[PDB]
């Protein structure tokens, strides 16, 4: 039911052309709601990926010579086409990933914003004129594109993560070759159709599908891949960083987080409950910024949990294309197993399930939104990310205790807390060890802000004025003989 | 013969205290000129290094809470003490490394400049106030110290590389634990004496000596080491990056380069010869920015080589503390063997040794400055770094040919060319694939410029306004409930 | 012959509504080619302007509260509408001002670029987070809109000067009330129609026509006018600055210049002649950046003047809407009188008219493009701006002599020189006393560059990242009690 | 009683030499405590000032050619000499102006900080490399010194205002000629002695004394004066801006303010009283940032006024060189008359004097610190600046009412308020119409912050990264022929 059926394609985008696997191999794409088959995308080997990388290298050589105005115009055309076809893209995203159609459309728009922002940033790549060491010399600092970039995106955001990687790379003058997740490769191919329609030159943007490990090896071992941007799990990031060591490749990583959610006694309780609802249960808890631990002060915990239960009662599961549906199915059975393991550990270690705690009657990978009280810091959920709709509530008594507990983790992606006092807000926001802190709000996604984490959560930033730094290399030129 | 004998020490600096190895093990330091023994520094194991890292962590916790003015004042005091004791530091450096005393003093001053610059930068770590997405929210971007940093420095610059790593780390509010090269550990310990005298708090600066591999493993595997800065060979950098993968550690690497030196027919020949003399033969060719290939256009090559031979005839070898001595001994016998191998390959492959080509009559590790004509692109020196005073001269005919030849390498550290036309200068400087380009000058060292390389030559920059970026982490704070 | 006849209007834009003079008074607009009447715009008194300023104040209060995204979207819509209707706008501009239709269209597009650039800049108004003086205090630096801005534009660019004033003002969140030149008020009103169509809120943009002096007095004496941007002659700028003194109003002025054009013996002669043709004879010499003195070295002067005469022979006068017409009529008879006076002074003082030197056979205000050799520094044209198509050629012998002669003026707007040597280019470009220097090019208009002059040529800049600074005020907030 | 008697001088500093008036005319300097004569400084006419301006022009020509490192080193030497001689400078300042010796020393140190900061900024004057419009052109933006600057300083801070004007001017490469207030010219001459001792070249720094109006006329009418920085009253600023109009001179003005002081019901009352004590009664209320109106919410006013009276009881008047003295005499009898007029208007219009209200028993220009309750918005003090130690207390009931009352003034220099809620702090700080806002603190002086006002309080900023912008001019260079 697509207004533009060309946005659904069964071929990979290599050297600006639509190709299939030369051995006929393919990977099926299935709808998570009922397992229905969608299409067979090509399964590309290492040789086709090598040819794609060579094409991307030539295209990058031709693409860095264009003016910043031309590249910005191409990126703006791509953004306009993405916003124009947002309904078809949202339908494809909901079909492949399973999130509610409203969430899919919100993702498409709020992440085409990244393409718009970096189209603006393409014209602001400014060098420097540094004072010289003597009268006979001047100093220029030029910023130049690093080269061919390789992007690896997860199933978590089939469209959202692609724009925030392709935008800065293209704006800087770099070429991109993207390997999307095999579970949800259709959003990438639709964006490739739009990019070709937008005037992106042949080879500058490429989407390759296939077995993840061989393509990652080709990305890590090809000398013509200057930079690799990766979003995904911590283990695959560590594997990539180990494999890219032999070539000294620039690596930008966004890995998992364990986001605390603190509610102080001087907070707005209704605002705190709304923020917890949007931070935890968005994408059915499958978001890298999703809250994973909810800390409440002892004097407020009862009222917070009462309002939270009242709000969780209103959640409705079902198919994403169904009106009134807030929660879609988990990505696969492993997510259900992990969520069950976390709930079982919570129950055994002393916690109490207040709501949910079992698979929903819909069957498949659907799960009831679970609210559990009495969680402690020894529990599995206290140190591990569920990626599923579970709301563990830990109680505290003092600000420094919750600061000690919230930083008791190796992941530094996101954190949230609710308070009114300015001194407390500044103190807690500076003390929390995270890349991003949301104060009195559960929504932090922004193409103008430096999205990214610290510690094991990865390196580099996405969006803002710092998002293009990783794709550029400095060149210090000393002009003598004046 | 030291004005301040306390600048020569036989102990490592751990937790702000002077300690020795608890097992009595030690590493001897010898003078490269005649093998004379200087002192026995401690050989520290992994447990002492672990305790040092813990102390550095506590010190960093206390040191990031100080105001930027206090940290800048401490760094400025350290710079003042370094400049005041420049003669003793230069004598220690010449004794341990072998470079001429004038070069040692120049190194000490021109690299204390880094400490001064980053003392100034400590007070300019500014956040951002980004426009909000709606009236109810504001956006702050804070910059915070990454944590405990570990520095590994080579024998190449026993003092120079330490200031440009300790300055930005301390200015950002990070703590440093440094492992200097075992060949030349005395400059680091002298700087540690001065740092303690300058008011650096206990644990903020640490110097540890011992076997390189166990300390590097401890640096890579300790969770309390947030960042690792390394300067050295490409192989050790690759080993470090592979070993740091399991912890997702921020890695800044300055690795080797293969610097071309181009002389066009529209160049100032006397200036070109002076630039080649300072770029190639400084530190007896043992510099990461030293020229390694000298390209000359066909119509200028004869006059350039005649003037170059006239200038090389004036070079004088001997002990560093001897007046009129321009060249000191190579670091060890491996450097002599590599230089001999390069000369032999040049002779066998068709090249002609015009001057030098053998060890000097002084014996030991001294080598005659060698000028060889007829070098080609298949020669070992054309793709490998000698780190020794050899001047290979390759001839070309056209600008694009020399651009193809100069970029025919995996190392992107430095490059030099001599030309007068503005269009040619801009075109060649933009086409050359290097981190740093010196136009009409063989001297590019500058604490105000972004020192660093591209491709395999490493990641990150030293000095300038970009030198402190690697030691800071961004924190995006979204302040809701307005 | 307008595709959209609503772009031609006979009413002023006040409080977001189209109004006429309440006393029936009006100002006629006539076509400079043959004096044909176009329309009668209102002649507004000081009371109507006062009401307009009050409306602009209320609108600014409502308009600074909108998000930067909304204001950028409005500005981008305005830019899109301007580019879409570029042909009708160009026809109106050619009818009112007289420039060739191709030049009018080029003006419309290349100055809507300013609106696009400042729409991008609207989202990049970033504050600062400065390190505090102690642990108990933080420092924010906010940037806020200055308030209601008043713009005064000349007949020189009926459309070009309006976008580069309205863009930054609206992007910053300021409101604008513009008084265009009485000779060419129709382009401003057409842009007002488009702005209303683009969603600019009522009062944020206002166009008022009438007697210049009373409206300027109202602008200078109204306390609700925070800032005044003026483009025009030096005398009116001095009058405005004297009249705005009593209120301490922020004043940005772009006044006249006396642009030198130097041709060195190492220059590209064909490029120099093309640059002189575009710099001097564009807009029939009626441009603030137009070359006014052409200096040539003694060894190149003959060939330069021969090629220049060959190129001037190809100029064709006539109506702007006529194919092949390069030169339109001067604005009025005063321009013809001034050009005749300059030619007469040149002839009497020793110079020789090589080409032109009299009114063309077309009659009216048309003038033959004049090339005069033998000009000296005592001549009237050497120190005064003709604003008419005369090419005075002064010869020199040395670089320092031409540097002394080119800086022998109180105006610092623009300068041009042609040379190839990098050292000479840097030296002369740094020595020339001008806001803008065009090296080897006669075209410098750019919305990404800081357009503006020094000395008597005015204060402030237009375009680039510095163009929005004048419309914002800093606010240093010190947050204590941490 | 000076450790260095050369810091007290009776001559003006012109062309780097110490001169007297060629007609023997002089101006006496008297101690405000008892009228005791100190020294006779020269009274310089317009011809000597013209010669000084010519010398400053030549010196600026020689001084902009020095490297940024050399100028920064000179400025740092000047700062070091100022801090070393802080006691003699403080004694001179207390003798000439009358403020307590502790305040004089604090002024000397905290304003030599400006010299240090701008010495650091001298090396950070960076140009830009903007992306070109096509492949054949590049764009540089250079920052160059504006030229010769003229500074006019008040008696308010005999030393404080001089460093924050001379630092940025010298760092940018501009020359300064300063005319200090005739009441307190000795601090300027002492700083000139130190500047000569610090290696400031002849003519770069000049101090001229004499009749204010002729020297101001010479500053405004000399074509070689590029920029004028003025600190003082609004009327003299308006006169200067009117007189500088004929030459289109860059004018930076810091004029008077009417600073509100708001205490909300959610504030820390002890902190509010301490902040009011330091903001109001510092320099006996003779400060441009001194609080002038104290607003208190109705529910807190009684306790605030009780604590304020308890703190005002502890103030001690007398000679500045006396231990335990907090308040010195007013500058002259006009200040006493104005303070008496304000107190009389407060008493007549309904207000009640709670403490003080008359001249102290010490006689002369001493005045008792006065606290008056019941002040309204019609009172003279509500719209006029006393510059004397009077604490008018106005009561309010709601936040928007106090926002309306605080902005009910044409002066936008400083404001203070005390609150704890983050939303209230952000809202009020953004709503207040002032250049500087001090939240929960009465101290805002900082060389790293943009000191300056809005509206009639003046234009431009002092300190921070924006303090050097006014002394530099942009130069857009377009390099064609690539
Ligand atoms: N924080 C984040 O952004 C993400 C977190 N996750 C984490 O991952 C778990 C499940 O997701 P996964 O499928 O494991 O994610 P993943 O990290 O394995 O998948 C992300 C991307 O990596 C690629 N990839 C996987 N193995 C690879 C290999 N050996 N070589 C090269 N590329 C390879 C995949 O094709 C995909 O494009 C979740 O429970 C959560 O912990 C899930 C998705 C993204
Ligand atoms: N470009 C540069 O900055 C440098 C280049 N070189 C290269 O290295 C060659 C000889 O120098 P090398 O002694 O090989 O340099 P290197 O890279 O091995 O030594 C640099 C530092 O690395 C440390 N290190 C060495 N092995 C380590 C290990 N396994 N784990 C942890 N740390 C370790 C050393 O203690 C020293 O502090 C030269 O021929 C040249 O190619 C030499 C010195 C520095």
Numbering used by the authors:
A (entry chain A), B (entry chain C), C (entry chain D), D (entry chain B): 8 to 489
From the paper:
SLA dehydrogenases (annotated as GabD or SlaB) belong to the sequence-based protein family PF00171 within the Pfam database, which are members of the aldehyde dehydrogenase superfamily.
Thus, cryo-EM grids were optimised and prepared with 1 mg mL−1RlGabD pre-incubated with 2 mM NADH. The RlGabD tetramer assembles as a pair of dimers. The RlGabD dimer is formed through domain swapping interactions of the three-stranded oligomerization domain of subunit A with the catalytic domain of partner subunit (B) forming a ten-stranded β-sheet.
